Amino acid sequence: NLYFQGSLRETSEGVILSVIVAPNARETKIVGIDGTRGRVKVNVAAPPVKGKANKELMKFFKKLFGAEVVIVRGETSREKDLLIKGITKKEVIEKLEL
């Protein structure tokens, strides 16, 4: 029963997916929804240093969506916004709900 609608918006350029990362994880994976923040809780299998969590986060979502993913907010924050270029909200929700 995970509802992603409060963590996404569809813009001129694609979809902005809003996440909150928890680093130091055994496995990169979606774990739930932070309804206070409107963000997907994502465990990231990387330490919080040297950009490594950013690289792993983008690798994971590029594979999931089959689209280019860039960080547009939160490069050095836990609360990161990911622009998935050229995609619709319907397609993103379908892939997140896998």
Residues of this chain that bind Na ion (CB under 5 A): 6, 35
Contact 40, 4 (CB under 8 A): yes
Q: Mapped to the 3 state alphabet, what secondary structure does 20-76 carry?
A: EEECCCCCCEEEEEECCCCEEEEECCCCCCCCHHHHHHHHHHHHHHCCCEEEEECCC
Least Å from the CB of residue 79 to Na ion = 14
Residue 52 CB, shortest distance to Na ion, in Å, is 28
- State which residue, 18 or 54, has the beta carbon closest to Na ion: 18
In the complex with Na ion, which residue's Cβ is closer, 6 or 48?
6
Nearest residue to Na ion on Cβ basis: 6
Q: How far is the CB of 35 from Na ion (least distance, A)?
A: 4
